[PDB]
Ligand binder design. Structure first.
Ligand code: NI
Length: 379
């Protein structure tokens, strides 16, 4: 009954994950269950009837929402990501069709041209790729897809970091307001110019708060994840000296996937148990929180042979960086496409890459870089 491990100073998160995978893969720390193995992680993610994503009370509050009655709650609490069927299926079905192969094939040119434009702005002597490429690309592309014209990309970055960081925090809308009220004003002022998916959401039976949460989810959530995928890929391909090989062997799709496995932008996700469940050899009581470590599962030697090595052509690569089951990332194809095109165009342009300075995104759940300063050789 209750037992503590924990990452200690001399160890490093992946060494701790390796230990937990070997010694204690389903672990109660006295407060929350932590899961580290591929087998049990996937099990938790796929068994939504027992491990719930309703962690925000979306379901408990739905009526006080569809009949109108709450007014200063945080919208990102009420999205498809924090709901269970049948509400989840209803919400997701409004947009499943948006990232279809045909539409992304029609956006390849826009994305490629945008990427080239962003690359045109990099100083090869010294520059921050996170600032010049990784951040602006997903904001511009998602803006095109949803039809929300984005004037000041920097205000938008601020709003995206503000909302993403504090996602699901039970609180009052005033908590911030200085940046957040501006974001809300923007979405209402631009709820007309919108693309088919946005119009479907506004003209629906969702409460106004659900409508905002849904639009914010699509517009802002994927931005930090895709930025971090791109920057993590740049670091990994440089650290492991893979740029030449990736180019000569056309490894872009496989190498980007290995970046997703090895350096997942999202490290963990959470479920709440609805009933007593057996998970492995452990019994977890109704109402407990389960933290699933995608980063650990993605290195499990039972699934990924030689899992601690970066293998740019690893195949199969059944990583969990986009999740598994009914909540499998809606935006996964778009994230992959933006990252593949970005890495492709960048690799075409610069032949010698030297990393000069890095600053990490400070937080144990998200994995990426606030700053990535590099030197480039043209030709
Ligand atoms: Ni204790």
């Amino acid at each position: 009954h209750h037992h503590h491990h924990e990452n200690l100073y001399f160890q490093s998160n992946y060494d701790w994950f390796s230990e937990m995978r070997k010694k204690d893969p389903v672990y109660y720390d006295g407060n929350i269950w932590q899961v580290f193995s591929y087998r049990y992680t996937k099990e938790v993610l796929n068994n939504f009837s027992k491990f719930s994503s309703d962690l925000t009370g979306y379901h408990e509050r739905l009526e006080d929402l569809r009949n109108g009655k709450i007014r200063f709650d945080i919208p990102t609490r009420y999205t498809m990501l924090t709901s269970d069927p049948p509400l989840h299926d209803e919400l997701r079905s409004m947009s499943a069709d948006i990232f279809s192969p045909q539409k992304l094939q029609t956006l390849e040119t826009f994305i490629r041209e945008t990427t080239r434009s962003l690359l045109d702005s990099i100083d090869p002597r010294e520059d921050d790729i996170v600032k010049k490429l990784a951040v602006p690309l997903p904001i511009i592309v998602i803006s095109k897809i949803l039809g929300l014209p984005i004037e000041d990309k920097e205000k938008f970055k601020e709003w995206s970091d503000l909302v993403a960081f504090r996602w699901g925090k039970p609180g009052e809308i005033f908590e911030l307001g200085k940046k957040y009220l501006e974001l809300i004003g923007y979405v209402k002022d631009h709820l007309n110019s919108g693309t088919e998916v946005v119009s479907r959401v506004v003209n629906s039976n969702l409460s106004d708060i659900e409508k905002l949460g849904y639009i914010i989810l699509l517009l802002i959530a994927g931005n930090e994840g895709t930025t971090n995928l791109i920057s993590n890929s740049v670091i990994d391909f440089t650290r492991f000296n893979l740029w030449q090989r990736i180019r000569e062997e056309n490894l872009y799709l496989k190498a980007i996937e290995e970046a997703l496995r090895y350096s997942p932008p999202l490290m963990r996700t959470v479920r709440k148990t609805k009933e007593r469940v057996k998970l492995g050899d452990q019994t977890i009581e109704e109402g407990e929180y389960v933290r699933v470590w995608i980063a650990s599962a993605n290195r499990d030697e039972e699934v990924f042979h030689d899992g601690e090595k970066f293998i740019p052509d690893r195949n199969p690569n059944p990583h969990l960086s986009f999740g598994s089951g009914i909540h499998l990332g809606l935006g996964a194809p778009l994230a992959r496409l933006e990252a593949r095109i970005a890495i492709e165009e960048f690799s075409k342009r610069f032949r010698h890459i030297e990393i000069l300075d890095t600053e990490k995104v400070p937080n144990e759940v998200l994995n990426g870089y606030k700053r990535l300063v590099v030197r480039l050789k043209s030709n």
